[PDB]
Design a protein around this ligand. Structure first.
Ligand SMILES: CC1(C)CC(=O)c2c(C(F)(F)F)n[nH]c2C1
Length: 208
């Protein structure tokens, strides 16, 4: 298990998301589904010139899996997935500029729900989650697990759990007072409101 410090800007963003009073937390789901859609767009496009990129799975979709026993909501996609370099360096580098702009916009009267316009919507996960675990598998790289409970650091390890084929699973370990996001009725409401035109099947799993 390797431990890394967030860039200062991202640590600042995470603290803002965690500490700001903002009741409209439900937008986290729209943001993560949007991320998934983008990742699915990417593998679909790449597969047009290299069909073998789908050897790791032809189906392009999104699953939403609530688990009341673990108090987790998992967003699974079969998108392009992320390399180790993506997890540690690439995405954080691109996120630095978007974070700065988002910060500036907020100071100018924007609100947290506009986070996606700055490309850092993933971090809206911390509106509802005390810890986020990301399991990801890109073609030609290993399956990794990224994890952070904020506090300025994240970890990355090679993942030994069930192999995924290709894609990303975002596991939201929900805050004690945010369990409404495990309810079927609530998730359906949010998907209908904010994600009705996503171009991939979204399956909301039901609890046993
Ligand atoms: C575990 C991540 C790599 C962290 C991160 O920084 C990020 C972003 C961001 F960079 F766009 F914010 N999008 N998706 C992710 C997942």
């Amino acid at each position: 298990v390797e431990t890394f410090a967030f860039q200062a800007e991202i640590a600042q963003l995470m603290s803002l998301i965690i500490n700001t009073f903002y009741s409209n937390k439900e937008i986290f789901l729209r943001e993560l589904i949007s991320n998934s859609s983008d990742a699915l767009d990417k593998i679909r496009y790449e597969s047009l010139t290299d069909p073998s990129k789908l050897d790791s799975g032809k189906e392009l979709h999104i699953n939403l899996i609530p688990n009341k026993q673990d108090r987790t909501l998992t967003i699974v996609d079969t998108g392009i997935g992320m390399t180790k370099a993506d997890l540690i360096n690439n995405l954080g580098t691109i996120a630095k500029s978007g974070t700065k702009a988002f910060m500036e916009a907020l100071q100018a009267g924007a609100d947290i729900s506009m986070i996606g316009q700055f490309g850092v919507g993933f971090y809206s996960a911390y509106l509802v989650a005390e810890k986020v675990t990301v399991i990801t598998k890109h073609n030609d790289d290993e399956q990794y697990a990224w994890e952070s409970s904020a506090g300025g650091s994240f970890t990355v390890r090679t993942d030994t759990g069930e192999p995924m084929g290709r894609g990303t699973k975002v596991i939201l370990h929900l805050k004690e007072d945010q369990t409404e996001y495990l309810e079927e009725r609530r998730i359906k409401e949010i998907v209908k409101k904010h994600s009705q035109f996503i171009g991939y099947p979204i399956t909301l799993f039901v609890e046993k």
